[PDB]
Design a binder for this molecule. Structure first.
Ligand SMILES: CCCCCCCCCCCCC/C=C/[C@@H](O)[C@@H](CO[C@@H]1O[C@H](CO)[C@@H](O[C@@H]2O[C@H](CO)[C@H](O[C@@H]3O[C@H](CO)[C@H](O)[C@H](O[C@@H]4O[C@H](CO)[C@H](O)[C@H](O)[C@H]4O)[C@H]3NC(C)=O)[C@H](O[C@]3(C(=O)O)C[C@H](O)[C@@H](NC(C)=O)[C@H]([C@H](O)[C@@H](O)CO)O3)[C@H]2O)[C@H](O)[C@H]1O)NC(=O)CCCCCCCCCCCCCCCCC
Ligand SMILES: CCCCCCC[C@H](C)CCC[C@H](C)CCC[C@H](C)CCC[C@H](C)CCC[C@H](C)CCCOP(=O)(O)O[C@@H]1O[C@H](CO)[C@@H](O)[C@H](O)[C@@H]1O
Ligand SMILES: *[C@@H]1O[C@H](CO)[C@@H](O)[C@H](O)[C@H]1NC(C)=O
Ligand SMILES: NCC(=O)NCC(=O)NCC(=O)O
Ligand SMILES: NCC(=O)NCC(=O)NCC(=O)O
Ligand SMILES: NCC(=O)NCC(=O)NCC(=O)O
Ligand SMILES: O=S(=O)([O-])CC[NH2+]C1CCCCC1
Ligand SMILES: O=S(=O)([O-])CC[NH2+]C1CCCCC1
Ligand SMILES: O=S(=O)([O-])CC[NH2+]C1CCCCC1
Lengths: 281, 98
């Protein structure tokens, strides 16, 4: 394969005042959620049979411990500074940390942060870098981390650049039968919202396919109809995908139109559905 | 950051087959801030047996959630997804049709 894969942990913290806050963290392999966080017991929730990713229970309990210390220290500092400057409440922090594996095996680390939905800072190579927007707060936090916080930055560098790629690849190998499976889509047709008097909206639904690459078109014979509109490839429960293809046509020109579906699981034999509509008595 | 209203997309795993197990999905994305009320409705009543993803956000930092529930449709019963946000004066609804 030539494709980039990535792993991320994401956090969302809301601080309403100095005595009340709440948070949420999770782990994601590409767009697939593979981990949660139980906040009462401070432990990792493994969503799949392969979610330990060939890590030993020892490294994992040590990561849980590390995350617990990190959460404690993070909230304690933010509250020390925001209680004095209490005009900031209520506010929301977004964190996204993790790594990407490029096609030749080169790892790339990531640690981005946002404040009320705006880029606040990031971690470029070895330096905490503020964003152009805001500065100040960004510059403050960045100086704080650059010069006033010990092996914290060292540990973050080691975590996003060595521990993360190793866990990514261990996850992929631990679930290879899930990772490399093929799942056949099923398709069906429906009408859509009326585009206007004397006009029809044809919809082709394609659902349950994995992996994500798919080809779906409205056709007349071998003429692909240029008007086909593809929707977002939406996620299903249990790792499959869903897709709508719609087409607007005058009634009287709808006969002969068909939906065609091409997917890796189909062994060359495409799915074809002819629009019937009100044509058949 | 300018508040963003949720996009709500409702869709089933399988073709509607009256008297057949099926999954109803509701994808809610592009909203900010993160506080939100999503419910799946059967005949205007909130379904409790539901599953949802943990909160996640795109690269523009707007949030998104997948909701789903297993169900069996009939001509009598209609299903919906209801969302309430700060950017919403009245709880917005999206209805599911065969
Ligand atoms: C392990 C992992 C590692 C850990 C990761 C986490 C680390 C990184 C993040 C943590 C740090 C973030 C960066 C922070 C940097 C900081 O350096 C700091 C320095 O900036 C300044 O700080 C000062 C703190 O002191 C503030 O001053 C205070 O502000 C307060 C709120 O505004 C009050 O202000 C008043 O509010 C009032 C509301 O009722 C009024 O409106 C007042 O208005 C005036 O009132 C008048 C009345 O007549 C007139 O009307 C006048 O006209 C009018 O102007 C106003 N008064 C003003 C403007 O002067 C205070 O004023 C009082 C008050 O009222 O409480 C007055 C009292 O009398 C006084 N009592 C006495 C006896 O005298 C009292 C007390 O002494 C004070 O000490 C405070 O209690 O304070 C004042 O002090 C400044 O704003 C502020 O800018 N910057 C900050 O952003 C702090 C908050 C940051 C929180 C973090 C947020 C997000 C964090 C993101 C983290 C990212 C994570 C990355 C992950 C990394 C991975 C490893
Ligand atoms: C949803 C769940 C996800 C599950 C998937 C598994 C995740 C997969 C496998 C890997 C992915 C990694 C992700 C990509 C990156 C995000 C990690 C998070 C964001 C940041 C963590 C770093 C913290 C900032 C703690 C560093 C500070 C301490 C301090 C220095 C080191 C000693 O520790 P300590 O124990 O405190 O020990 C310390 O030793 C020091 C002595 O030098 C002392 O200063 C301290 O007092 C203390 O004793
Ligand atoms: C802090 O926020 C919590 C959550 O809303 C609230 O119950 C509590 O009263 C707040 N404290 C105040 C407003 O002093
Ligand atoms: N800074 C918010 C935070 O991380 N709180 C710790 C925690 O465990 N929160 C769970 C909750 O109360 O929502
Ligand atoms: N490791 C536990 C923690 O830091 N916070 C959770 C807690 O103490 N209580 C859960 C709650 O109040 O919701
Ligand atoms: N908010 C905690 C949680 O349960 N997150 C993920 C999830 O799967 N929820 C499904 C449910 O219990 O309704
Ligand atoms: O509030 S809360 O449920 O404690 C949020 C937990 N976030 C953590 C997830 C795993 C490591 C990064 C921090
Ligand atoms: O179909 S696809 O979802 O684009 C495949 C690539 N994404 C990853 C999903 C979870 C397992 C590793 C592969
Ligand atoms: O806009 S976007 O390209 O879809 C951003 C990608 N979201 C991923 C980031 C963190 C883990 C969840 C999946």
């Amino acid at each position: 394969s030539q494709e980039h894969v990535s792993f991320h942990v994401i956090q969302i913290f809301s601080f309403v005042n100095q005595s009340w806050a709440r948070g949420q963290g999770s782990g994601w392999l590409d767009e697939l959620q593979t981990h949660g966080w139980d906040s009462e017991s401070g432990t990792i929730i493994f969503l799949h049979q392969w979610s330990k990713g060939q890590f030993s229970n020892e490294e994992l309990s040590d990561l849980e411990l590390l995350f617990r210390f990190y959460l404690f220290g993070l909230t304690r500092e933010i509250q020390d500074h925001a209680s004095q400057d209490y005009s900031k409440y209520p506010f929301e922090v977004q964190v996204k940390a993790g790594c990407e594996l490029h096609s030749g095996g080169s790892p790339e680390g990531f640690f981005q942060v946002a404040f009320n939905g705006l880029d606040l800072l990031s971690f470029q190579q070895t330096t905490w870098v503020p964003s152009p927007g805001c500065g100040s707060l960004a510059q403050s936090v960045c100086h704080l981390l650059n010069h006033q916080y010990e092996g914290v930055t060292e540990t973050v560098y080691n975590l996003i650049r060595s521990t993360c790629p190793r866990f990514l690849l261990g996850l992929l190998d631990a679930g290879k039968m899930y990772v490399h499976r093929q799942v056949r889509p099923e398709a069906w047709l429906s009408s859509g919202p009326s585009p206007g008097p004397g006009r029809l909206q044809l919809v082709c639904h394609v659902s349950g396919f994995y992996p994500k690459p798919v080809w779906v078109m409205w056709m007349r014979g071998e003429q692909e109809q240029q008007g086909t509109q593809l929707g977002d490839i939406l996620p299903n429960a249990n790792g499959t995908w869903y897709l709508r293809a719609t087409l607007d046509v005058a009634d009287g020109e709808a006969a002969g139109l068909s939906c065609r579906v091409k997917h890796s699981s189909l062994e060359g034999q495409d799915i074809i559905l002819y629009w019937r509509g009100s044509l058949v008595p | 950051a300018i508040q963003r209203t949720p996009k709500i997309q409702v869709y089933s795993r399988h073709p509607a087959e009256n008297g057949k197990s099926n999954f109803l999905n509701c994808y809610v994305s592009g909203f900010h801030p993160s506080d939100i009320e999503v419910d799946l409705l059967k005949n205007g009543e909130r379904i409790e047996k539901v599953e949802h993803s943990d909160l996640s956000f795109s690269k523009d930092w707007s949030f998104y959630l997948l909701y789903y529930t297993e169900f069996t449709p009939t001509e009598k019963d209609e299903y919906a997804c209801r969302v309430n946000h700060v950017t919403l004066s009245q709880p917005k609804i999206v209805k599911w049709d065969r």
